[PDB]
Amino acid sequence: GRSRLLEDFRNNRFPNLQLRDLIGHIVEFSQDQHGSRFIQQKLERATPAERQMVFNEILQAAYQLMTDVFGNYVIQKFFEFGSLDQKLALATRIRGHVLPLALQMYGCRVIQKALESISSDQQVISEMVKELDGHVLKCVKDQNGNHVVQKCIECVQPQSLQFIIDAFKGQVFVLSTHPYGCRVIQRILEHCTAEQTLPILEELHQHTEQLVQDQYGNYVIQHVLEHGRPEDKSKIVSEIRGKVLALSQHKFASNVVEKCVTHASRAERALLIDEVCCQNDGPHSALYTMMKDQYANYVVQKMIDMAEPAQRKIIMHKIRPHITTLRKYTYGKHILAKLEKYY
RNA sequence: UGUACAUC
């Protein structure tokens, strides 16, 4: 179960081995740790004829190599450097098995490579994508599958992805708090059409408070703040208003408040800063609490850099009476140069 | 001083 060529190769007997030396031994080498790397590296510069010689051998073991820990790299190399015909032939061996492969550690890498290598205009890719219909959430929740779903969204014509949008109906919030689901949701926000992202964004806005405080959900909300439409940033802002001081002190939500300050309009950014700038909450002002907090102090620094003229004047004036008193904290010892750059 | 994203 091991040709002599492979032994001598692994035993460093062939300092100048070449692709054409592997005639008849391609599938064997493709399953070997060093043989796979060797083939990968040689495929890049191989002639059309040499590449075809290789393809002819990988073809008869294609599916097997797709789920092989080393062989999968050889299959991918062909999606990168293969002819359109060789790529369509490999894809055809994927078709019929998309689901199992999507859920497989090495198979999912092959499917992903095919999606970025063949236009979604082709029937193979078109019919491949459709095999996921009826299993969308299963794949989203899978450690391997989720990456295939992300890949379809990034790569395939959005109109054909309506079955993915449909499968998230009613579960956008829940999946936005899921380690993998949050990634797929962001891909959707990036690549889908206005009609498709509409119901997605509606569900997000129905749970903003829970999302901004979630370990994954806060990324989904910042995405909208960073990349979304003004009408969606405004909805998010409306839910943050009346909550700035509170959310500012939260590990996750504090990043969302920073993003509201950065990507909100002039009148919105000031209404958020005013909430803590010219407002009050007992003996001291909201700024007093935020200054010393392990998280809110990052928000304070952000408002300072984004605030209007008359706004920064007040922020520094409420922070003024507590300067020397603000050294003990390991957190506030960074607002130091802060009140020395705009002071 | 503060949070996610997988193979040789």
From Swiss-Prot:
<feature type="region of interest" description="Adenine-nucleotide binding in RNA target">
    <location>
        <begin position="182"/>
        <end position="186"/>
    </location>
</feature>
<feature type="repeat" description="Pumilio 2">
    <location>
        <begin position="57"/>
        <end position="92"/>
    </location>
</feature>
<feature type="repeat" description="Pumilio 4">
    <location>
        <begin position="131"/>
        <end position="166"/>
    </location>
</feature>
<feature type="repeat" description="Pumilio 6">
    <location>
        <begin position="203"/>
        <end position="238"/>
    </location>
</feature>
<feature type="region of interest" description="Uracil-nucleotide binding in RNA target">
    <location>
        <begin position="72"/>
        <end position="76"/>
    </location>
</feature>
<comment type="subunit">
    <text>Homodimer; homodimerizes in vitro. Interacts with DAZ1, DAZL and NANOS1 via its pumilio repeats. Interacts with NANOS3. Interacts with SNAPIN. Recruits the CCR4-POP2-NOT deadenylase leading to translational inhibition and mRNA degradation. Interacts with DDX20. In case of viral infection, interacts with DHX58. Interacts with TRIM71 (via NHL repeats) in an RNA-dependent manner.</text>
</comment>
<feature type="region of interest" description="Uracil-nucleotide binding in RNA target">
    <location>
        <begin position="297"/>
        <end position="301"/>
    </location>
</feature>
<feature type="region of interest" description="Uracil-nucleotide binding in RNA target">
    <location>
        <begin position="218"/>
        <end position="222"/>
    </location>
</feature>
<feature type="repeat" description="Pumilio 3">
    <location>
        <begin position="93"/>
        <end position="130"/>
    </location>
</feature>
<comment type="function">
    <text>Sequence-specific RNA-binding protein that acts as a post-transcriptional repressor by binding the 3'-UTR of mRNA targets. Binds to an RNA consensus sequence, the Pumilio Response Element (PRE), 5'-UGUANAUA-3', that is related to the Nanos Response Element (NRE) (, PubMed:21397187). Mediates post-transcriptional repression of transcripts via different mechanisms: acts via direct recruitment of the CCR4-POP2-NOT deadenylase leading to translational inhibition and mRNA degradation. Also mediates deadenylation-independent repression by promoting accessibility of miRNAs.</text>
</comment>
<feature type="repeat" description="Pumilio 5">
    <location>
        <begin position="167"/>
        <end position="202"/>
    </location>
</feature>
<feature type="region of interest" description="Adenine-nucleotide binding in RNA target">
    <location>
        <begin position="108"/>
        <end position="112"/>
    </location>
</feature>
<protein>
    <recommendedName>
        <fullName>Pumilio homolog 2</fullName>
    </recommendedName>
</protein>
<feature type="domain" description="PUM-HD">
    <location>
        <begin position="1"/>
        <end position="343"/>
    </location>
</feature>
<feature type="region of interest" description="Adenine-nucleotide binding in RNA target">
    <location>
        <begin position="36"/>
        <end position="40"/>
    </location>
</feature>
<feature type="repeat" description="Pumilio 8">
    <location>
        <begin position="278"/>
        <end position="317"/>
    </location>
</feature>
<feature type="region of interest" description="Guanine-nucleotide binding in RNA target">
    <location>
        <begin position="254"/>
        <end position="258"/>
    </location>
</feature>
<feature type="repeat" description="Pumilio 7">
    <location>
        <begin position="239"/>
        <end position="274"/>
    </location>
</feature>
<feature type="repeat" description="Pumilio 1">
    <location>
        <begin position="21"/>
        <end position="56"/>
    </location>
</feature>
<feature type="region of interest" description="Non-specific-nucleotide binding in RNA target">
    <location>
        <begin position="146"/>
        <end position="150"/>
    </location>
</feature>
